[PDB]
Fold Heme acquisition protein HasAp.
Amino acid sequence: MSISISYSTTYSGWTVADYLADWSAYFGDVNHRPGQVVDGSNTGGFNPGPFDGSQYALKSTASDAAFIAGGDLHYTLFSNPSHTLWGKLDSIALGDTLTGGASSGGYALDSQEVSFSNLGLDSPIAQGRDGTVHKVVYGLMSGDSSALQGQIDALLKAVDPSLSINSTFDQLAAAGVAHATP
């Protein structure tokens, strides 16, 4: 099946692009870069882990913002090509207050704002950091939602060419693609 969106009633009138720019700015940058991963505060984590699973989750350094990437995900760590997220990305959940982890049976958000599901993205290991899955998720880590925006846009176009990243969540609901939280 094709892209499926969940949205808080708050954002009914908001556009997906406007939402993502404010989200990404609110989440900020955890500075997950060479020489800047010196402890556990900015790694995120995998479920089940240690470097592969059905979820990768990360919370903001600055705020209570967090995201959960869902799929069948893999991370090379120090192995060539190094520091590459690859695999199937099915979903991206954005919201507040990450709970849980590997030891409690999964990551969760207390307050989900928006989620994008059935993304159908799939990157092979050998593509390295140029893979779409890596760029999408690493962008969210870095306070840049661009790659994710582009991919959401393309998927929406394919459902109905009047739909885009610049559509309202309400508009997307009218087209069969999104649903507000009751």
Summary: The two ends are 23 Å apart (CA to CA). Residues 1-182 form a domain with the Heme-binding Protein A; Chain: A; fold (CATH 3.30.1500.10).
